[PDB]
Design an enzyme around this catalytic site. Structure first.
Site, short mmCIF file in Angstrom:
data_model
loop_
_atom_site.label_atom_id
_atom_site.label_comp_id
_atom_site.label_asym_id
_atom_site.label_seq_id
_atom_site.Cartn_x
_atom_site.Cartn_y
_atom_site.Cartn_z
N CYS A 105 0.85 -1.18 0.00
CA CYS A 105 0.00 0.00 0.00
C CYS A 105 0.89 1.24 0.00
CB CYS A 105 -0.95 0.01 1.20
SG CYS A 105 -2.04 1.44 1.18
N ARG A 108 -0.17 4.50 2.62
CA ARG A 108 -0.16 4.32 4.07
C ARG A 108 0.27 5.55 4.85
NH1 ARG A 108 3.65 -0.57 4.93
NH2 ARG A 108 4.34 -0.08 2.77
N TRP A 277 -8.98 5.93 -1.50
CA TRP A 277 -9.23 6.53 -2.79
C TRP A 277 -8.14 6.07 -3.75
CZ3 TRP A 277 -8.58 9.73 1.55
CH2 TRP A 277 -7.27 10.19 1.73
N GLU A 282 -3.66 3.21 -10.98
CA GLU A 282 -4.44 1.98 -10.94
C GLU A 282 -5.47 1.98 -12.05
OE1 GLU A 282 -5.49 0.84 -6.61
OE2 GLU A 282 -5.03 3.03 -6.57
#
Ligand code: HEM
Ligand code: HEM
Ligand SMILES: C[C@H](O)[C@H](O)[C@H]1CNc2nc(N)[nH]c(=O)c2N1
Ligand SMILES: C[C@H](O)[C@H](O)[C@H]1CNc2nc(N)[nH]c(=O)c2N1
Ligand SMILES: Cc1cc(N)nc(C#CCN2CC(F)(F)C2)c1
Ligand SMILES: Cc1cc(N)nc(C#CCN2CC(F)(F)C2)c1
Ligand SMILES: [Cl-]
Ligand SMILES: [Cl-]
Ligand SMILES: [Gd]
Ligand SMILES: [Gd]
Ligand SMILES: [Zn+2]
Lengths: 401, 401
Positions: A105, A108, A277, A282
């Protein structure tokens, strides 16, 4: 302790936190497998023991009255029931840690700002659906997206698991075609087949939002249509290529991963969807340009009148850059939170510095943190990273079917 | 125990049985992955036996005739002298396998076409310089680049060591200032100061070709001015951006790594410069756009009138693509062999398929195989990879000071 170098700046740190890595990954000194996508009361006791220690360190009351009271309580409860229950604050902390500890992630920096919805009292698929709609509605927040997780009842002896069969709360149908191909999103062929098999009347667009297959314990999965007005979408246009809107491309606002298992102090929550979000890559790079996804890259490049007959023109790179521009512009235009890969990687660098002070390191999956375009243009590319599994954690789990 | 390797673009599955050999040990443990880190007597007979055994299997000469024989002469050579000299063809077959084995090299589809210049009878830096100058001019070959490796004398005790002090045969200068910052290439700054230390007139420019510090055993290095007509360089211009040429950018044709240590059958060659040809992103993305290298990205974006006031304009991405376009365009106009990152990774995917049939897998460092721009637009991104150390090998070695 692994020495870690930042090659853009010269920085050097040692990842003392990696020595606390409980569960074990796929690499050995013989061979590294970092690039692979998919890498008893006594042991329940020591996981619980460890997490409770974590929780009490975090509230600046380590070794105190309440601390050893909880340890005994938990041991007692495991002796008498084979399991134990988390207190709400422990749950909130456990869910935040899971995000904090998630090595793949890049977002973070936000780990502390997480809305935890306790749904551990959830009773059926139908109540589960209501919890999920409230999650989506809260998280979506009309485009000003908020990070949230809804935590459904833990795995426990005697009863099946709550499970969300959908890999995300919002997914687009993928219909295998007449001529062997896929209309819509190919990542969702199986779940789409399952939805039909469980009574969904399909659509036949490319951006057909999937219904939820929600599994209550020892129940077959149950089909639930998301209300259209709950699923905020963003039609995709380009600031300058006006023919871009005629592609009819859309993406949805809310990335809510729903098929992962939340693990807190040995307890397992097989249903705990979480949402933040999007980072624009992506959508712009992976979801739309992956050959095995929407695969629009050549169609965009041809429209751009790039020379697609040689690679050295860099038509792929150029069409993808503009697809990412369109995503960013569209979400900004629609007032839906989005972070570009440059902002995201910079904030993750600040997360790494914060984490080094706070914990002595940070688990990070370089191949997942470095964005799929413009990798060395972002600061994370030049940052060495130590990948290891800390608990609490989000883990992959097999599909329920 | 045979790692399942998957390609996520196609769904194809393979197993890396070759990983089962891993002679050296990588930096990863089940507890932490360190795969993203840049730099992680008669033992000699084990590596020598093994290498010779490879050689004869590869010419379909397992257990026959000169196999047994050559096994004796290495036995006897080490027995008598404490080392051994490689049969010329072995030096050639090990040179190729070391390249074949380099996990970080994306260009290994070429591993079988390599020119091995045997410099093992070398003595003195004046001897090296002409061996190197022969290489350089052979390899440059008027821009029609040809993979070459010059193998200088192996290492023995009691004697010094052959070492090229520069990381590459062609490196640009990097000079500090009355304000600390660097004119020229900051990756070299160190070797640039040693050249000036050993009596070199420092140029003023941002692309002064660095001389060569050549080191014969037990002697201080000697500076050598490379023949300017031997250093093939490409001025950088852009096909459509007329002002790009005005930025005065250049890069050299020949990428020749002159600081790594070739290891064949247990022998160690601390001077074995190998060369091939550039992949464009090495120059256009890493060498020119890394913040700690030439750091030209903003300059080009200013020139393109891009919105550098927000990261979400993707001005870094746009400028970077054009810089790569200029590198490709300039090299092809000067008829210098260059390969774009798409052609290169495509050929690497072909190499993997080859090596699967041939050796049952291939050691690949995902983080180095995936190009620094447009990573997921290339097929290697979606290719899981197993990293491990096979012998023979190119190894990193300490700076000779
Ligand atoms: C708020 C902004 C957030 C951003 C910008 C962000 C960014 C990302 C990105 C880019 C990925 C890689 C996904 C992929 O490429 O498939 C990822 C993965 C992940 N994130 Fe975050 N995320 C955010 C919020 C969250 C939250 C709220 C949680 C948990 C509570 C979380 C936990 C995870 C996990 C477990 C993964 C791995 C998922 C997988 O393997 O598919 N993230 N994140
Ligand atoms: C002929 C075409 C070739 C191409 C297109 C190519 C491409 C590349 C690239 C892009 C890298 C990454 C290095 C970096 O980014 O710093 C690399 C690394 C490497 N290659 Fe190749 N290469 C070629 C030839 C060769 C040859 C001839 C050899 C040896 C005989 C070789 C052995 C290596 C080694 C040892 C590395 C790692 C060096 C390091 O760590 O800096 N390659 N190659
Ligand atoms: C095979 C390869 O490791 C795989 O495609 C990975 C690479 N890195 C990734 N990184 C992110 N953020 N998301 C991904 O889906 C992937 N996919
Ligand atoms: C920190 C990180 O491992 C480092 O910057 C690596 C990543 N991948 C790379 N890949 C290539 N080809 N060349 C490099 O220099 C690097 N640098
Ligand atoms: C919370 C969150 C934020 C974000 N920005 N991204 C993701 C993601 C992802 C990975 N995808 C979903 C899957 F299908 F499960 C694989 C998740
Ligand atoms: C043979 C070869 C071909 C290529 N295309 N690239 C390289 C490279 C490299 C690594 N760079 C040079 C350094 F300074 F040593 C670091 C090497
Ligand atoms: Cl997604
Ligand atoms: Cl280089
Ligand atoms: Gd336009
Ligand atoms: Gd102008
Ligand atoms: Zn590893």
């Amino acid at each position: 302790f692994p020495r870690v170098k930042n090659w853009e700046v010269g920085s050097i740190t040692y990842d003392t936190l990696s020595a606390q890595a409980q569960q074990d990954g796929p690499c050995t000194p013989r061979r590294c497998l970092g690039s692979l996508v998919f890498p008893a009361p006594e042991q329940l006791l020591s996981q619980a023991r460890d997490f409770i220690n974590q929780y009490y360190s975090s509230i600046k009351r380590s070794g105190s009255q309440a601390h050893e009271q909880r340890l005994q309580e938990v041991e007692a409860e495991v002796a008498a029931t084979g399991t134990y229950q988390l207190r709400e604050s422990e749950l909130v902390f456990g869910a935040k840690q899971a995000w904090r500890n998630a090595p793949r992630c890049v977002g973070r920096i936000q780990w502390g700002k997480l809305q935890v919805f306790d749904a551990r009292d959830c009773r059926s698929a139908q109540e589960m659906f209501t919890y999920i709609c409230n999650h989506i509605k809260y998280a979506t927040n009309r485009g000003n997206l908020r990070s949230a997780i809804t935590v459904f009842p833990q795995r426990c002896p005697g009863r099946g698991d709550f499970r969300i069969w959908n890999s995300q709360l919002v997914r687009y149908a993928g219909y295998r075609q007449q001529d062997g191909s896929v209309r819509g999103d190919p990542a969702n062929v199986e779940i789409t087949e399952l939805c039909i098999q469980h009574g969904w009347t399909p659509g036949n667009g490319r951006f057909d939002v999937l219904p939820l297959l929600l599994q209550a314990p020892d129940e077959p999965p149950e089909l639930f249509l998301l209300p259209p007005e709950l699923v905020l979408e963003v039609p995709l246009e380009h600031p300058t290529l006006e023919w871009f809107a005629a592609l009819g491309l859309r993406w949805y606002a809310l990335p809510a991963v729903s098929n992962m298992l939340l693990e807190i102090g040995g307890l397992e929550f097989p249903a705990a969807p979480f949402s933040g979000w999007y980072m624009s890559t992506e959508i712009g790079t992976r979801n739309l340009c992956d050959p095995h996804r929407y695969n629009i890259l050549e169609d965009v490049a041809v429209c751009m009148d790039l020379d697609t007959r040689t690679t050295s023109s860099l038509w792929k790179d150029k069409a993808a850059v503009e697809i990412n521009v369109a995503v960013l512009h569209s979400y900004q235009l629609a007032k839906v939170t989005i972070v570009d890969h440059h902002a995201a990687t910079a904030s993750f660098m600040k997360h790494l510095e914060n984490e080094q002070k706070a914990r002595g390191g940070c688990p990070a999956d370089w191949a997942w943190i470095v964005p799929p375009i413009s990798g060395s243009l972002t600061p994370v590319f030049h940052q060495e990273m130590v990948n290891y599994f800390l608990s609490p954690a989000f883990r992959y789990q097999p599909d329920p079917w």
